[PDB]
């Protein structure tokens, strides 16, 4: 089997992407944030504290003939941005782009933090990291991809995020029309539960390529590109007037600037992030100070190849017995 779903930016900055997901019988369609940096599929629901719901579409398990309470199971998760959610668990039928999993753990939110409430466009998350990170207790649950794997034509899913435009998540096949040149595959460590890999270096604009190992995670659920302070400093030094602002919480730059591209290495191959991808616009409405799309990972504890980087590539998440990551230009 295979699945194919369109994923759509939630706003004009590509702050995140939502993908429609069918849950239950009859189908309840929720727009979820596919997150290769976490491993919980959780949804706004009929159980969510009413004051914490503001415009989201909710899952109502009592209206699904295939929903079953997973007795005794609870979940609770905290994300790198400080947001969080928690609740209990149902199993139900979940379909993504024509691909159906029965008995999928659907984590029903009783509580969500303000960040989720305030984002009316995201109805929940669908985690696509390794199931070892799943927070369901006392019986850890599998991700949608894990449950689907054996049924898939090939044990892979691909992320093809658009710049200011829709893209595609495919399950079970590689669309060879969706990228240019070849896919370069690179090793993955699952030790931390992430799609963790090592970039072979970077360049800034038309600058020479610096060969250097950068360990990081391919994370569709993170907006920006978080890299070592040395790298990030080298990038913003090429932007007149750019500076790190503690009060804003990262690198800002004059909105009148033309940003240089950023290249990252995948083995001997190179992915080029156009400068425009690195512009996240005024820090506040009307400001002439713009927020940078490349930020320091110092104090995160991990480098993150988030959407800024991933949207410049066609990315293969290869879930074979020995997982790997593939990158192609597009």
Coordinates of C-alpha atoms in Angstrom, one line a residue:
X1 CA 0.0 0.0 0.0
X2 CA 0.9 3.7 -0.3
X3 CA -0.5 7.0 0.9
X4 CA -0.1 10.5 -0.5
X5 CA -1.3 13.7 1.2
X6 CA -0.9 17.4 0.6
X7 CA 0.6 19.4 3.3
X8 CA -0.1 23.1 3.5
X9 CA 1.6 26.1 5.3
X10 CA -0.6 27.4 8.2
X11 CA 0.4 31.0 7.5
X12 CA 2.4 33.3 5.2
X13 CA 5.7 32.5 7.0
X14 CA 5.5 28.7 6.7
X15 CA 5.5 28.6 10.5
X16 CA 4.2 25.0 10.3
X17 CA 2.4 22.7 7.9
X18 CA -0.9 20.9 8.2
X19 CA -1.9 17.7 6.6
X20 CA -5.5 16.4 6.6
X21 CA -5.9 13.1 8.5
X22 CA -9.1 10.9 8.7
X23 CA -9.8 9.6 12.1
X24 CA -12.6 7.2 13.0
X25 CA -15.7 5.9 11.4
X26 CA -17.4 7.9 9.9
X27 CA -14.2 9.8 9.1
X28 CA -13.5 12.9 11.2
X29 CA -10.9 14.9 9.3
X30 CA -8.4 16.8 11.4
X31 CA -5.5 18.9 10.1
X32 CA -2.4 17.7 11.9
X33 CA 1.1 18.9 12.1
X34 CA 3.3 16.0 10.9
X35 CA 6.3 16.0 13.2
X36 CA 9.4 13.9 12.4
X37 CA 10.8 15.1 15.8
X38 CA 8.2 13.5 18.0
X39 CA 6.3 10.2 18.2
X40 CA 2.8 11.0 19.5
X41 CA -0.3 11.3 17.4
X42 CA -2.5 13.6 19.5
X43 CA -5.6 15.6 18.8
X44 CA -7.8 18.3 20.1
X45 CA -10.9 16.4 21.2
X46 CA -14.3 16.4 22.9
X47 CA -12.3 15.8 26.1
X48 CA -10.1 18.9 25.7
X49 CA -10.7 21.6 28.5
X50 CA -13.2 23.8 26.8
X51 CA -11.4 27.1 27.5
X52 CA -8.3 25.6 25.8
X53 CA -10.1 25.1 22.5
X54 CA -10.3 28.1 20.2
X55 CA -11.3 27.2 16.7
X56 CA -9.6 23.8 16.3
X57 CA -11.5 20.9 14.9
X58 CA -12.0 18.3 17.5
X59 CA -12.0 14.5 17.5
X60 CA -15.1 13.1 19.2
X61 CA -14.4 9.4 19.9
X62 CA -18.0 8.7 21.0
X63 CA -19.1 9.5 17.4
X64 CA -16.7 6.9 16.0
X65 CA -17.9 3.4 15.8
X66 CA -14.3 2.1 15.6
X67 CA -13.0 4.1 18.6
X68 CA -12.0 2.1 21.7
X69 CA -10.7 3.5 24.9
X70 CA -7.2 2.2 25.6
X71 CA -7.9 1.4 29.2
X72 CA -5.6 3.0 31.7
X73 CA -3.4 4.7 29.1
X74 CA -2.3 8.3 29.5
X75 CA 0.1 10.6 27.8
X76 CA 1.9 13.8 28.4
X77 CA 4.4 15.5 26.2
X78 CA 6.6 18.7 26.3
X79 CA 8.1 20.1 23.1
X80 CA 11.4 22.0 22.6
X81 CA 9.5 25.2 22.2
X82 CA 8.1 24.8 25.7
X83 CA 4.6 23.8 24.6
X84 CA 2.8 20.8 26.0
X85 CA -0.3 18.6 26.0
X86 CA -1.7 15.6 27.8
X87 CA -4.7 13.3 28.0
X88 CA -5.9 9.8 27.5
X89 CA -5.8 7.4 24.6
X90 CA -8.1 5.7 22.2
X91 CA -7.4 3.3 19.4
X92 CA -9.2 4.0 16.1
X93 CA -8.8 3.9 12.3
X94 CA -6.5 6.6 11.0
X95 CA -6.0 7.2 7.3
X96 CA -3.5 9.5 5.7
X97 CA -3.8 10.2 1.9
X98 CA -5.5 6.9 1.2
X99 CA -3.3 4.9 3.6
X100 CA -5.2 3.3 6.4
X101 CA -4.0 2.0 9.8
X102 CA -6.4 0.2 12.1
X103 CA -5.9 0.2 15.8
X104 CA -3.8 3.4 15.8
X105 CA -3.3 5.0 19.1
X106 CA -5.1 8.4 19.0
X107 CA -4.0 10.4 21.9
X108 CA -6.9 12.6 23.1
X109 CA -5.9 15.9 24.7
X110 CA -7.5 16.8 28.0
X111 CA -5.1 19.7 28.4
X112 CA -3.0 21.7 25.9
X113 CA -0.7 24.7 26.6
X114 CA -1.6 28.2 25.4
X115 CA 0.6 27.9 22.3
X116 CA -1.7 25.2 20.9
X117 CA -4.9 26.9 21.9
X118 CA -3.8 30.1 20.2
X119 CA -3.1 28.3 17.0
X120 CA -6.6 27.6 15.5
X121 CA -5.1 26.0 12.4
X122 CA -3.5 23.0 14.1
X123 CA -5.8 20.3 15.3
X124 CA -3.1 18.1 16.7
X125 CA 0.3 16.4 15.9
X126 CA 1.1 13.2 14.1
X127 CA 4.5 12.1 15.2
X128 CA 6.9 10.5 12.8
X129 CA 10.1 10.0 14.9
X130 CA 10.9 6.6 16.3
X131 CA 8.3 5.0 18.5
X132 CA 10.8 4.8 21.4
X133 CA 9.9 8.5 22.1
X134 CA 6.1 7.8 22.3
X135 CA 4.9 9.1 25.7
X136 CA 1.9 6.8 26.3
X137 CA 2.1 5.1 29.6
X138 CA 2.1 2.4 30.9
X139 CA 2.2 0.8 27.4
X140 CA 4.2 2.7 24.9
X141 CA 2.4 3.0 21.5
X142 CA 3.6 2.9 17.9
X143 CA 3.6 5.8 15.4
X144 CA 1.4 5.8 12.4
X145 CA 4.4 5.1 10.2
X146 CA 5.5 2.2 12.4
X147 CA 2.0 0.7 12.3
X148 CA 1.8 1.2 8.5
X149 CA 5.3 0.0 7.7
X150 CA 4.8 -3.7 7.0
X151 CA 1.8 -2.9 4.7
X152 CA 3.8 -0.3 2.7
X153 CA 5.2 -1.1 -0.7
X154 CA 8.5 0.2 0.7
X155 CA 9.2 1.1 4.3
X156 CA 9.6 4.8 3.7
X157 CA 7.9 8.1 3.9
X158 CA 9.0 11.3 2.1
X159 CA 8.6 15.0 3.1
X160 CA 8.3 17.5 0.3
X161 CA 7.6 20.8 2.0
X162 CA 6.8 23.9 -0.1
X163 CA 8.2 27.4 0.2
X164 CA 5.1 29.5 0.6
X165 CA 3.2 26.8 -1.1
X166 CA 1.7 23.4 -0.6
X167 CA 3.8 20.2 -0.6
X168 CA 3.4 16.5 -0.1
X169 CA 3.9 13.7 2.4
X170 CA 4.1 10.3 0.7
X171 CA 4.1 6.9 2.4
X172 CA 5.4 3.8 0.9
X173 CA 7.0 5.1 -2.3
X174 CA 9.5 7.5 -3.7
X175 CA 8.0 9.9 -6.3
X176 CA 10.9 10.1 -8.7
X177 CA 9.2 13.1 -10.5
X178 CA 9.3 15.1 -7.3
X179 CA 13.1 15.9 -7.3
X180 CA 16.0 16.7 -9.5
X181 CA 19.2 14.8 -9.8
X182 CA 19.8 12.0 -7.4
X183 CA 18.9 11.3 -3.8
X184 CA 21.9 11.2 -1.5
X185 CA 21.4 8.9 1.5
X186 CA 23.2 9.3 4.8
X187 CA 23.3 7.3 8.0
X188 CA 20.9 7.8 10.8
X189 CA 21.3 7.2 14.5
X190 CA 18.1 6.3 16.3
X191 CA 19.9 6.4 19.7
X192 CA 17.9 9.5 20.8
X193 CA 14.7 8.5 19.0
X194 CA 15.2 11.1 16.3
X195 CA 16.0 11.0 12.6
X196 CA 19.5 12.0 13.6
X197 CA 22.2 12.4 11.0
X198 CA 25.5 14.2 10.3
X199 CA 25.8 16.9 7.8
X200 CA 29.2 17.2 6.1
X201 CA 29.4 21.0 6.3
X202 CA 28.1 24.3 5.0
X203 CA 28.6 27.3 2.9
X204 CA 27.2 30.9 3.2
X205 CA 26.1 32.5 -0.1
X206 CA 28.7 32.0 -2.8
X207 CA 31.3 31.3 -0.1
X208 CA 33.6 28.3 0.0
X209 CA 32.3 25.1 1.5
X210 CA 33.5 24.4 5.0
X211 CA 33.9 20.7 5.6
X212 CA 32.7 20.0 9.1
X213 CA 30.5 17.4 10.8
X214 CA 27.3 18.8 12.1
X215 CA 25.2 16.2 14.0
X216 CA 21.5 17.1 13.9
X217 CA 17.9 15.9 13.5
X218 CA 15.6 16.2 10.5
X219 CA 12.6 17.7 12.2
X220 CA 9.5 18.7 10.2
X221 CA 7.9 20.0 13.4
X222 CA 10.4 22.7 14.0
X223 CA 10.1 25.9 11.9
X224 CA 13.7 27.1 11.7
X225 CA 17.2 25.9 11.2
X226 CA 19.2 25.6 14.5
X227 CA 22.9 25.2 14.1
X228 CA 26.1 25.7 16.2
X229 CA 26.8 29.3 17.2
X230 CA 29.9 29.4 15.0
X231 CA 28.0 28.5 11.9
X232 CA 25.2 30.8 12.6
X233 CA 27.6 33.7 13.4
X234 CA 29.4 33.1 10.0
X235 CA 26.0 33.3 8.2
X236 CA 24.7 36.5 9.8
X237 CA 28.1 38.2 9.5
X238 CA 27.3 38.3 5.8
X239 CA 24.1 40.4 6.4
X240 CA 24.6 44.1 7.0
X241 CA 23.1 45.1 10.3
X242 CA 22.2 41.6 11.5
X243 CA 22.7 41.0 15.2
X244 CA 21.7 38.6 17.9
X245 CA 19.1 40.2 20.1
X246 CA 18.5 38.7 23.5
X247 CA 15.3 40.7 23.9
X248 CA 13.9 39.3 20.7
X249 CA 15.4 35.9 21.3
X250 CA 17.7 35.4 18.3
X251 CA 19.3 36.9 15.2
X252 CA 17.4 39.8 13.6
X253 CA 18.2 41.7 10.5
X254 CA 17.1 44.7 8.6
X255 CA 14.0 43.9 6.7
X256 CA 15.6 45.9 3.8
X257 CA 18.4 43.2 3.5
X258 CA 18.8 40.7 0.7
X259 CA 19.7 37.5 2.5
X260 CA 22.5 35.1 1.2
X261 CA 21.7 31.5 0.6
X262 CA 22.9 28.8 3.0
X263 CA 24.2 25.5 1.8
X264 CA 24.4 22.3 3.9
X265 CA 26.2 19.1 3.0
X266 CA 24.7 15.7 2.7
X267 CA 27.7 13.4 2.1
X268 CA 29.3 14.8 -1.1
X269 CA 26.0 16.4 -2.2
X270 CA 24.8 19.9 -1.4
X271 CA 21.4 21.4 -0.5
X272 CA 21.0 25.1 -1.1
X273 CA 18.5 27.1 1.0
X274 CA 17.7 30.3 -0.9
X275 CA 18.1 33.4 1.1
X276 CA 14.4 34.2 0.9
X277 CA 13.7 31.0 2.9
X278 CA 15.6 32.5 5.8
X279 CA 13.3 35.6 6.1
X280 CA 10.7 35.2 8.8
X281 CA 9.5 38.7 8.5
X282 CA 9.0 41.6 11.0
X283 CA 9.6 40.7 14.6
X284 CA 6.3 42.6 15.3
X285 CA 3.7 44.1 13.0
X286 CA 5.1 47.1 11.2
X287 CA 8.7 46.6 12.5
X288 CA 11.6 47.1 10.1
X289 CA 13.6 44.4 12.1
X290 CA 13.1 41.0 10.7
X291 CA 13.5 37.6 12.3
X292 CA 16.2 35.2 11.0
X293 CA 15.4 31.7 9.9
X294 CA 18.8 30.4 10.9
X295 CA 19.4 30.5 14.7
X296 CA 21.8 29.2 17.2
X297 CA 21.2 25.7 18.7
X298 CA 23.4 26.6 21.7
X299 CA 21.4 25.8 24.8
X300 CA 19.0 23.6 22.8
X301 CA 21.4 20.7 23.2
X302 CA 20.9 19.5 19.6
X303 CA 21.1 20.9 16.1
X304 CA 17.8 20.9 14.3
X305 CA 17.3 20.8 10.5
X306 CA 13.8 22.2 10.7
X307 CA 11.5 23.3 7.9
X308 CA 13.8 26.1 6.7
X309 CA 16.3 23.4 5.7
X310 CA 13.9 20.6 4.8
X311 CA 11.7 22.6 2.5
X312 CA 14.8 23.2 0.3
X313 CA 14.9 19.4 -0.3
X314 CA 13.0 16.3 -1.2
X315 CA 13.6 14.2 2.0
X316 CA 13.4 10.4 2.3
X317 CA 12.8 9.0 5.7
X318 CA 13.9 5.4 5.2
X319 CA 12.5 3.2 7.9
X320 CA 14.2 0.0 6.8
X321 CA 15.7 -2.2 9.5
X322 CA 18.7 0.1 9.3
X323 CA 17.2 3.5 8.9
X324 CA 18.7 6.2 6.6
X325 CA 17.9 9.7 5.4
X326 CA 17.9 10.7 1.8
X327 CA 18.1 14.3 0.4
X328 CA 17.6 15.5 -3.1
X329 CA 17.4 18.9 -4.6
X330 CA 14.1 19.8 -6.2

